[PDB]
Design a binder for these strands. Structure first.
Ligand code: MG
Ligand code: MG
Ligand code: MG
Lengths: 43, 243, 95, 117, 154, 76
RNA sequence: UUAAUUUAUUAAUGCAAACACCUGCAUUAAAAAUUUCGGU
RNA sequence: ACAUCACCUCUAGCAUCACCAGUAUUAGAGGC
RNA sequence: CCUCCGCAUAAGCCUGCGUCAGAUCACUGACAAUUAACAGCCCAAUAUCUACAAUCAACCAACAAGUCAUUA
RNA sequence: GCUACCUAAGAACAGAUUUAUAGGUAGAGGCGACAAACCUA
RNA sequence: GCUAAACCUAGCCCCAAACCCACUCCACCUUACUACCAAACCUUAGCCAAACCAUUUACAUAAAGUAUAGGCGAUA
């Protein structure tokens, strides 16, 4: 099945940085990745 | 591995650290002491040692300070030392039943006062217990002069006390313009809570507001090193004048 | 107001210790309601020619409604504080 | 489903390509008809002088000697620049010495800097 | 060109030197790219980096003179005006102000910059402290134990 | 019924705190720093103006100060 | 769910408290919440 | 077997974020 | 001998059978590419008009009741 | 971002149709021509 | 015989002490790694153990594991 029909505009929407930083739980998510020390700190 | 100083004073550790550690020593004292107020619901026990009820044994007993559940909005006015209680209770107050979490919220009233020290009418929410406290103090200005800010347990009243202290230590004619007789009469009446003019600097502000007063106080346009080297050359010329 | 108490009696703490309470210690039992307690009248000294309650210079204990809402807000009466007591005694003795 | 690359030009749709750009500095403005007007005012202006007759060649000959790395110390340069003027003036109000109250009127101010590189 | 030796030249001479450096460096870049195009060795491999180094030294002299000017005339430390503050990731940093027309009481973008941190940054911040300390004790243990083995070698 | 709901209209202003209402003391607001934030008191700025005169945002003068606004309106 | 029990929560009343608003106490429901639907 | 036009029954006399920018020939819920 | 495909833009990926050499049904390293009129990227204020569908739009014929205009 | 339902605003030829794109409804849920079906093996 | 084996030593381990981290230029909360116009605090919950289940229950040395409390049933 071809479920993953992604699109770049909706990609940077639902996985971007502004939206992932709009509510403070996402800020906590950013911090959790940071102390996890990844590279792709957002999408 | 282990961190050297204890985190139980980690916040206190920062209190001696840097730019904020350049704050006034009076501000350090006012943020340092932790005197407790009279309770809102924790009625004080009698004395140090007393006889046990079912044992008849002289035992020393203290009283529990119940934590004051302070909603944010009550800070915006001059409430009392009372508030709500977020706890639990039993259905028939019987411990052999399934208890449920419970709340004890206050009944406030929006009233008004007209302070001569402020020489203005402020209308805000207060308590009937707070009304009784002011009446026992016999005046809102005397109440602001009377209780500790830690005893105040309210931001707006603390701010009002800060303003009253600044007005009292200022003695500016703008408090009672075209009526210096009433100003002198009130100043004699309000001579009790006189404070130094320096004491009005960090009067009752937030710890964040203390940092704010620091950044407003410690900052300045840096001295010109053209001016600094000019002054150094003038000093060198004055020294060589003696040479 | 209202006063409550810790129903399950709290463990003692001592001199230089904080009451590191129990999660059971948050449940209080209501002892009394000061808002439901019997009210006391407020004693104050009048300064103006009041109605049937009193006259100027008359110190009495009136209801808190007439005192705070009517007398004190209008400034017809002032508090009978010990500093105001000297002023009232001087006003009475200078008659 | 790929993320580890950089965010250069080629990412998604038309306008999604449209907004961002590589490391240029903007030169113009966007006005009606989707027409850009670029003023000669905001443009880069690289006016190099004439190179004729300067005897300093691009490389330096190895036959010359070596010296000591004298960093431009602020007090040292200030003394070297202001020594004669102060020496005459004290033998004789820093405006005669050229102290700048504010650089609000100068072409090349310092704080903030308006010069280039 | 030696830096202090280059430091004795005039500012107009400095402009002349920079332009000559630009020409020679361009010659170097074209030659190297052509060498790749011809897939052969380089004729003067040290020449490109040497011209780059001399240009960098001239730039260092220029920066020294501009820094002496900034120190004399006003004395501000970082040449761009800016500050130290805290960002939404909770860390302490130095932010740079940007030259922009409209004011901070009306700046529609700058006001969107959430530069505030409420208490929800505590556990992560102390955790960052913990990771820093872990790397610290790791490096210290590695160095001293390597020293112990080193002394064992004697 | 007046036309238009208030929901998509302008946001209602929150209550300014009594700290700004202090009769004697000016509060330590957010002026010195650059953060429209919760950790301080809110800066209160006066009405500033754009001193520069440029095509991009020069708004019209008010239409009571207009050089030609007659009481007798033209039916056009 | 009309098994049982409450009622943390609303909604009503009524009574308090204050001179339409808030808090407390009872009852009632709505909705919930806690616990039961055994063996050969 | 579910939806449904048709039909029947019941509740609600009315407004600024849905119903609705509507007013019982209306709005919602059940049956065949 | 097949071709209900194919060619383009769209989206979406990211240089992915271009060139010079290796040897891995008989991929790796280095070098070179895609030079805009199409498409985005926009639009100086304050007020003020904006009922007369479209269907080849002239008829008939309607309902599900209309997808697009400035001006001062 | 598949799909279910809805909004915005386009498209094809004859509706209880399908679909390019954005956006919205979060589990103690939504959605549901109610299949005790769906919401990323 | 081939595949294979085997080899030290990278650095991790805990402690001791000690308070640490954050500016080459730049850019970086809009679609983060793009030079630009008019808003915060609101009691953690729950099982488990009661051999099922319900009130109860945790998230320096010494007195002393005694005095307090337990569907007075488990313990704390
Ligand atoms: Mg074109
Ligand atoms: Mg979707
Ligand atoms: Mg059990």
């Amino acid at each position: 099945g071809n479920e993953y029909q992604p699109s770049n505009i909706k990609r940077k929407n639902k996985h971007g940085w502004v939206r992932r930083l709009s509510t403070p739980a996402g800020v906590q998510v950013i911090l959790r990745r940071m102390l996890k020390g990844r590279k792709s700190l957002s999408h | 591995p282990l961190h050297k100083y204890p985190v139980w004073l980690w916040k206190r550790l920062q209190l001696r650290e840097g730019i904020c550690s350049r704050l006034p020593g009076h501000y350090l004292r006012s943020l340092e002491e932790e005197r407790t107020p009279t309770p809102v619901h924790y009625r004080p026990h009698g004395a140090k040692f007393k006889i046990n009820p079912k044992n008849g044994q002289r035992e020393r007993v203290e009283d529990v300070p119940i934590p004051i559940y302070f909603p944010p909005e009550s800070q915006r006015g001059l409430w009392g030392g009372e508030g709500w209680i977020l706890g639990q209770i039993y259905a028939n107050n019987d411990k052999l039943s399934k208890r449920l979490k419970k709340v004890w919220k206050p009944q406030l009233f929006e009233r008004e006062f007209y302070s001569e020290i402020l020489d203005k009418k402020f209308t805000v929410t207060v308590t009937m217990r707070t009304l009784d406290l002011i009446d026992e103090a016999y005046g809102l200005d005397f109440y602001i002069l009377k209780t500790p800010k830690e005893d105040l347990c309210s931001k707006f009243g603390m701010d009002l006390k800060r303003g009253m202290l600044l007005r009292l230590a200022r003695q500016d004619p703008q408090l009672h313009p075209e009526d210096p007789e009433r100003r002198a009469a009130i100043y004699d009446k309000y001579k009790e809570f006189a404070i130094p003019e320096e004491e009005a600097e960090w009067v009752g502000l937030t710890l964040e507001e203390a940092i704010e007063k620091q950044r407003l106080l410690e900052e300045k346009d840096p001295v010109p090193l053209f001016k600094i080297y000019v002054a150094e050359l003038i000093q060198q010329l004055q020294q060589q004048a003696l040479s | 107001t209202v006063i409550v108490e810790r129903w399950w009696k709290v463990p003692l703490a001592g001199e230089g210790r904080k009451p590191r309470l129990h999660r059971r210690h948050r449940v209080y039992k209501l002892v009394e309601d000061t808002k439901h307690r019997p009210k006391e009248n407020l004693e104050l000294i009048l300064t103006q020619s009041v109605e049937n309650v009193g006259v100027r210079g008359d110190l009495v204990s009136v209801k808190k409604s007439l005192g705070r809402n009517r007398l004190l807000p209008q400034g017809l009466a002032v508090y009978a504080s010990p500093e105001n007591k000297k002023l009232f005694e001087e006003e009475k003795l200078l008659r | 489903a790929d993320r580890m690359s950089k965010w250069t030009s080629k990412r998604g749709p038309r306008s999604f390509r449209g907004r961002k750009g590589r490391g240029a500095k903007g030169i113009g403005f966007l006005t009606s008809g989707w027409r850009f007007v670029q003023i000669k005012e905001m443009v880069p202006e690289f006016v190099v002088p004439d190179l004729t007759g300067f005897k300093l060649k691009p490389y330096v000959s190895y036959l010359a000697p070596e010296s000591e790395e004298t960093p431009l110390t602020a007090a040292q340069l200030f003394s070297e620049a202001v020594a004669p003027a102060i020496e005459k003036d004290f033998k004789d109000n820093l405006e005669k010495y050229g102290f700048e109250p504010t650089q609000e009127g100068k072409l090349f101010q310092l704080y903030p800097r308006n010069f280039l590189r | 060109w030696t830096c202090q030796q280059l430091r004795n030249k005039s500012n107009e001479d400095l402009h002349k030197l920079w332009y000559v450096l630009l020409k020679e460096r361009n010659m170097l870049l074209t030659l190297e790219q052509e060498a790749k195009r011809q897939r052969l060795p380089m004729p003067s491999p040290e020449r490109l980096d040497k011209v780059v180094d001399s240009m960098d030294a001239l730039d260092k002299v220029v920066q020294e003179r501009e820094d002496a000017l900034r120190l004399l005339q006003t004395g501000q430390e970082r040449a761009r005006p800016g500050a130290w503050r805290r960002d939404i990731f909770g860390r302490i940093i130095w932010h740079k102000f940007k030259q922009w027309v409209i004011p901070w009481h009306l700046n529609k973008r700058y006001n969107r910059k959430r530069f505030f941190a409420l208490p929800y940054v505590d556990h992560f911040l102390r955790l960052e402290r913990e990771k820093r300390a872990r790397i610290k004790a790791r490096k210290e243990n590695l160095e001293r134990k390597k020293a112990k083995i080193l002394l064992k070698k004697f | 019924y007046e036309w238009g709901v208030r929901s998509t209209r302008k946001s209602e202003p929150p209550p300014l705190d009594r700290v700004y209402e202090i009769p004697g003391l000016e509060p330590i607001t957010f002026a010195g720093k650059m953060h429209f934030v919760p950790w301080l008191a809110r800066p209160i700025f006066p009405p500033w103006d754009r001193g520069y005169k440029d095509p991009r945002f020069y708004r019209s003068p008010p239409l009571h100060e207009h050089p030609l606004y007659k009481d007798q309106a033209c039916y056009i």
